[PDB]
Scaffold this active site. Structure first.
Site, short mmCIF file in Angstrom:
data_model
loop_
_atom_site.label_atom_id
_atom_site.label_comp_id
_atom_site.label_asym_id
_atom_site.label_seq_id
_atom_site.Cartn_x
_atom_site.Cartn_y
_atom_site.Cartn_z
N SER A 99 0.83 -1.17 0.04
CA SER A 99 -0.16 -0.01 0.07
C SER A 99 0.75 1.29 0.17
O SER A 99 0.37 2.40 -0.01
CB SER A 99 -0.95 0.03 1.36
N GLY A 100 2.07 0.94 0.20
CA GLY A 100 3.16 2.00 0.43
C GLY A 100 2.85 2.63 2.03
O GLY A 100 3.25 3.75 2.25
N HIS A 125 2.38 15.95 14.86
CA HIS A 125 2.45 14.37 15.02
C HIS A 125 2.34 14.02 13.55
O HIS A 125 1.55 14.14 12.86
CB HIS A 125 1.19 14.07 16.16
N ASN A 127 1.08 11.16 12.54
CA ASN A 127 -0.26 10.67 12.17
C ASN A 127 -1.35 11.65 12.22
O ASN A 127 -1.97 11.67 11.23
CB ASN A 127 -0.55 9.40 12.98
N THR A 183 9.91 -6.52 -48.82
CA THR A 183 8.81 -7.13 -47.98
C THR A 183 9.19 -8.50 -47.77
O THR A 183 9.87 -9.16 -48.68
CB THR A 183 7.41 -7.03 -48.69
N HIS A 184 9.23 -9.22 -46.53
CA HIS A 184 9.76 -10.61 -46.15
C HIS A 184 11.29 -10.47 -46.45
O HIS A 184 11.89 -11.75 -46.46
CB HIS A 184 9.41 -11.74 -47.11
N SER A 315 34.81 -1.39 -31.14
CA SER A 315 35.36 -2.77 -30.74
C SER A 315 36.70 -2.62 -30.03
O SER A 315 37.48 -2.04 -30.55
CB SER A 315 35.28 -3.55 -31.86
N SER A 316 36.74 -3.24 -28.84
CA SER A 316 37.97 -3.40 -28.04
C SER A 316 38.97 -4.43 -29.04
O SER A 316 40.10 -4.16 -28.55
CB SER A 316 37.76 -4.12 -26.97
N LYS A 321 36.32 -0.60 -36.65
CA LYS A 321 34.92 -0.63 -36.55
C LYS A 321 34.00 0.21 -35.69
O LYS A 321 34.35 0.51 -34.68
CB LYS A 321 34.71 -2.13 -36.16
N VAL A 322 32.88 0.62 -36.23
CA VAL A 322 31.92 1.49 -35.71
C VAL A 322 30.48 0.61 -35.53
O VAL A 322 30.19 0.14 -36.66
CB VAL A 322 31.70 2.89 -36.14
N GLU A 328 21.04 0.08 -30.45
CA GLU A 328 21.16 -1.05 -29.50
C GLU A 328 20.51 -0.44 -28.20
O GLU A 328 19.90 -1.06 -27.77
CB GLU A 328 22.58 -1.23 -29.31
#
Lengths: 465, 460, 460, 465
Positions: A99-100, A125, A127, A183-184, A315-316, A321-322, A328
């Site tokens: 309920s939090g 108080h 409450n 397509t496909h 790439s390590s 390469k990029v 991603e």
């Protein structure tokens, strides 16, 4: 030196609370009780709790239920909490009582401690005063729906608007950049890059539409219903008056009291509805990001249709390469939103009688989905979409290469013969044009001039604008 | 205040005190998405692997002793958590985890640069020697996951199963009414129920264990695409040998196929299904327990849960089953995480699945939540449970379905008529049988009473 | 035309020719929801079990020979599929499957009534003797599921794995460019890739097998709540003994805990996670294959798929990868089914999980779809695949990343500069190395050529 | 005797087709190619394909593209298909090529066979004539969105309206039937059964709202876009004209052409959006059905709050037992809708370039979800909700039994003391009233008369209407 404590108490007894903490007994119990994820409420959720506690105090003050000195001290303390001055004072886990209650008491206790160390000190108080007219059962999901509305309206929609504009900008810039439809994954008939990007822009526009269509119910706040939705211990019209304060201070036009006060506490179906919008967007974004990384695939062994802006060495190990890192990030976020959606759904279905006790987990997941979508959308524009470059010559070549450019001959020679034309062109590595000639099809059904008008690839993409 | 570092894309302003470099700084700029980075367990796993790799390069004479030793020492520091603040990259980074791999490479170089004696190591050429992100980052992931499975969740689950087994025994003669469809069934004992729950957790452990053969497979040695290019013969076997010696995880192994281990993360999907099953078990156990504790006066009132905190900011004295709430919400989260891992797993393309960071994030989170909530569920709930035995006994004797064992004597249809008559007239089953004239050749009084005994009926 | 039958709730009009009775008729009236009933495999499983139960009651002297024999004969007819039209109840029936259990009971009674010699058996007292729906219906489910796993999916998967292994071998020297992140990587062979896919399926089989220990557990003998009330000592062991003899499934066993086996269907959730993993594997394999077949001219053009049908109602001559489409759509369905089974599994209460029919429906469907699509994927796609070897070779030699094996000679940063220069000037890697003056003490021409060889680089 | 075949052909060659079949070559290939689930298109999907094929022929006729004799024969045959006279002539599996090429050809071939056996025979070519101006890529998802719109508007919404009315009827009938609220499954403060059922009625009303809010996009049909969304081989305004015919014949006001013709073929995000509405409803329904079976739990060991209508003997073994079978049907359906949603999501995210090729699986799952929800909702009313009976005395007792009826004393004695009152009452099995007396709280802060006014349970439920 060693950790120091002072004594606090609740209705279960005395608890040792760390000396530097502004929280009190019930927060401390919850700290001991729920050490599960090690993550607490977000900045957005603490802000909402802060704003709500202030508005409640304001209304209690307005109606004569809470004395001015007390109300004013709760409001000043609540303002500080809203402003982010006390985030370290909300240490309670996400995976607390459903309920939090704990986070609601967190806010109540923290405000009380702030008010006590003010000038002059004011004793409220946690409450009786800070929680006057409230339950956790309306306030905690009110703070949730408030934060969710805020994230939708101020965070996601503006980001999506920005992504959409960036896509529509490519739709216009690339309107006559012909290429081969696919397509496909197979050679289809010509399209332009612009038409594709207009597609994407609409996916995002329809996403904005989707988010907006949830707001009338994502905007409903149960504040006023207190413990079970009957509003016991709250004055007549409390919820209406709180919402009026919250609308004025936040500028969120979409906040409203609940249509049914028992529905708004027995269920969090609005959170399930909002999640469905974002999971749709995750699907749109996955599609968009995918087509973009595919188009950028290469440099040499892929589709090589567009160039994505370089953002970091790819790439390590593979030097030079990029990688399409932004798509991603987009597709991973989409996956997270989908998983979060499922977590929200389980929560949403598991309510019992007067209270759904899955509010923290549902809150956590919906708000995360909003943040990730909003952030990734802005980056997707600035670090990817805006600076895309089309390989226009290679793309026209692709358009001209599909054997399916025979398609507009259907009305002249019939589907079956056109298929034979395409099969022959490809088996004998001839152009569709020459194959038509060879198969003896130039005559009364089709002149050379009609054949050339019809195989024109840019004409075949039928640019509308 | 900033200093300049560079990578092959050029020069980058890095905060002066920071131990990371150019590639890490770009990742910080490129992915501010979630504001959360790798977890402690992931950083640790990365550190151990980087030390393991330098050990093997050293053993094989590929990396000079001074350089290897500097890297080993630095990676150990990372492993022990002395540099978690030096890993600021978002989870939602490039899906191979290139950025976090370079983050480890860069921070190691910086540590080495200021060690005694100081040693210059290149992040690519030396610290990344014989490695790709494509084998190391999923290796670190699968290492973290196997560590979590074996040292965290399994022990927590064993602890929960023992607590349930303890209740299964302690309550073996505590008779109560069974409920099926939520309706009054025949007698069971509370212990039988808890034996049920204990088996669920025992089956959970079996389910986690069954995933280890594939969860513990590490692609290390496959480098860029799976072919092992730029790594020497047996790099993987040897790194895994070192990792087993240092971690003591017996389940780690090289991949059966070095392409499957980089083109897919199917072992993570598999691991998640185990966790998803446990989520379902835990939801059931927790629900039964909150339902059994329901009241004080308006629910079932079968058991009392230990009070952990005031239940209500408004309803004074009320207490709530906060621990089964934590459990069932953890279960929901694990189910969500599973859907995320599923979307990641199906989305690989060719030589690389590029969802490793989101998959890793969700699998490791499900592990931790489950292990943590499980322990708490014992200490703060299951251990202190108290049965209301006399009320349970009353429930067992109140179910009209206790007419069931009379089926073989009076047949189902007459027994149904007995039940319906008892209920409609507010009479007992025994008395209804008598009233309906069934005592005779069909059934003696001795037999009626023998068969209506609720503790016998529960058949302990 | 109708006849009257009755149950304990009273009289019901049943279609005159129908073999089912009162309780089945009410279920037909109560649940017209999906319009689909139990599958052939489920009806078969129910029939076998009902015959098995009557066999055991007969062996133990609880059910007279005439009655047992009539039931056995009738249940065999049901098993062999002579009465599928006599099972009209919806899947979305009472979650215990009481309705379908009574459907089997009623239809058996009707068959027996007209057999030679005719024999009157009571659906409750005789055909349901020693049974509940709560043990028999999940027993039949788990029996169907184990049968599908062992006799349908595993063999189909073994067939797909063999087809992939065949390609792994046939194409072991077919060099091509690797792709990671969708970008040009280093060399691999098509065979390596297919070895990858074959392992995925081999791992799939391992994943299904690992579920059998718990998937093959049958609650039979636990009756109403798990206590075995109204069944004799050892009813379960004995029914399971008969089922193993008749079906030849070695994996069937009694439940470890008879309450877990009725309070939960966690073994079905577990079974589904295995299937969900396979869905992800199959999506990847199928995607790679459609991407490899993409063209004729505007995609990657790596392989040719067997033509199965005209691709387009409008685009003449076009052909489409219809089989990988079937596969990836089957995968989606299995993932959905998994979410359904998950919602069912977490939703048990006390002595009974009442989601057995929806769980059973989705688990069995995932099995059949996967087994069926898998076989087709071999015969109509994988077996006929043809590699465009020379084009692949051209791709392998075109990737600028073939500079990678020079790292140890020229260092990563210089190799990057070589790659970037080659690409920007449209020069080869070899020529760029030469141009940049790297031949010398660093690297001989002999070495350059040795290391740039794409087939060596793929390291078969 | 043995199965007989006649020869048909397509562009791949000759195929043996069963003699009694009205389908031709391409359908037969698909039969051999996809024997996967053994389930084909539903009645609703065949009807939609039938209606669409007729409308296309109508428009082709209208624009002079297709001769009257041919158009009229295609329309008559399409009408028969729409009317369900040829369902056995669609044997193709759901799990066919993802554009629905096969089912589109199914329709084309079947129409051609019907037209050939008419009086007089009319020869139409399945591609050139029945498929004129069409691709599978617009027509198959057009038939899908059409069926989905139909199911939403004619099937689900009316059922949900009926469920809602039945719930609201209990909300009014039970407005003063007091009982104990329950939060966290523990004794809360009084509510009425009516207020609970008003909650449920709103959940269902908000469900209707949810379905409606998807329609503007679920209603979009790509008809006109043909192969890639460019509308090549279709006349100007074809889609508009088809939709106009379809709107007139179906009476579905919500059908419309696509906002972006490439979005409507590259994606099925509208199907994902519609699924999100129904998954929300599955969550509402699970909650509602759950509270109802819990309230009906017993007869003796449960909550025993209400009596559900008996529908069938509950147990093959436990005689006389009756079970909440309808709520079980409702909750199982909800589970299926949730699983179906996830299957739709996977499909939705997996599009590439010009075509999402997951239309059959997404079609299958969305339409199923609609049917199950619609059917279960009507049964839930007629066989469960309408005939519920409240155990009114037992419910008032429950209301009076909660120790939390001390809650309205908070303003008079403070939260902490009220908690002590509740703890003591319960430890000593005393009433809240007597405990207040015993603890010496009657005085200036609280008279006996105020204490009795405030503990009145029906007053405490604060009935609004």
């Amino acid at each position: 030196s060693e950790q120091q404590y002072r004594i606090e108490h609740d209705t279960m007894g005395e608890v040792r609370v760390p000396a530097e903490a502004l929280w009190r007994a019930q927060t401390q119990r919850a700290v001991e009780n729920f050490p599960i994820s090690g993550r607490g409420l977000e900045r957005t959720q603490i802000r909402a709790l802060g704003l709500l506690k202030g508005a409640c105090a304001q209304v209690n003050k307005d109606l004569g239920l809470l004395a001015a000195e007390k109300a004013d001290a709760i409001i000043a303390a609540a303002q500080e909490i809203a402003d982010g001055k006390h985030d370290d004072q909300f240490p309670i886990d996400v995976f607390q009582t459903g309920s939090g209650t704990s986070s609601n008491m967190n806010a109540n206790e923290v405000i009380a401690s702030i008010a006590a160390q003010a000038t002059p000190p004011v004793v409220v108080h946690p409450n009786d005063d800070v929680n006057m007219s409230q339950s956790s059962n309306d306030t905690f999901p009110t703070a949730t729906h408030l934060a969710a509305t805020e994230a939708a309206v101020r965070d996601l929609i503006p980001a999506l608007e920005y992504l959409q504009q960036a896509l529509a900008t490519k739709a216009k810039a690339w309107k006559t950049v012909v290429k081969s439809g696919r397509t496909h994954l197979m050679d289809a008939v010509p399209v332009t890059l612009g038409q594709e990007f207009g597609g994407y822009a609409r996916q995002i526009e329809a996403g904005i539409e989707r988010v907006k269509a949830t707001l009338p119910r994502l905007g409903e706040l149960p504040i006023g219903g207190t413990a079970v939705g009957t509003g016991l211990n709250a004055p007549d019209g409390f919820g209406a008056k709180v919402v009026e304060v919250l609308k004025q201070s936040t500028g969120l036009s979409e906040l409203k009291t609940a249509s049914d006060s028992f529905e708004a506490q027995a269920a969090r179906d609005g959170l399930v509805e909002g999640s469905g919008a974002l999971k749709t967007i995750a699907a749109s974004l996955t599609k968009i990001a995918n087509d973009i990384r595919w188009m950028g695939s290469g440099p040499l062994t892929g589709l090589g249709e567009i160039q994505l802006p370089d953002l970091q060495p790819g790439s390590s190990i593979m030097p030079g390469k990029v990688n399409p890192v932004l798509p991603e990030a987009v597709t991973q976020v989409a996956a997270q939103v989908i998983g979060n959606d499922a977590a929200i759904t389980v929560g949403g279905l598991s309510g019992a009688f007067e209270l759904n006790v899955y509010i923290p987990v549902m809150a956590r997941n919906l708000l995360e989905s909003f943040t990730l979508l909003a952030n990734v959308s802005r980056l997707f524009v600035d670090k990817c979409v805006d600076g895309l470059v089309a390989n226009e010559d290679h793309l026209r070549t692709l358009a001209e290469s599909s054997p399916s450019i025979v398609t507009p001959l259907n009305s002249a020679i019939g589907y079956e013969e056109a298929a034979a034309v395409a099969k022959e062109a490809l088996k004998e590595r001839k152009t569709i044009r020459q194959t038509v000639i060879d198969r003896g099809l130039i005559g009364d059904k089709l002149s050379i001039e009609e054949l050339d008008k019809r195989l024109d690839v840019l004409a075949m993409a039928k640019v509308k604008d």
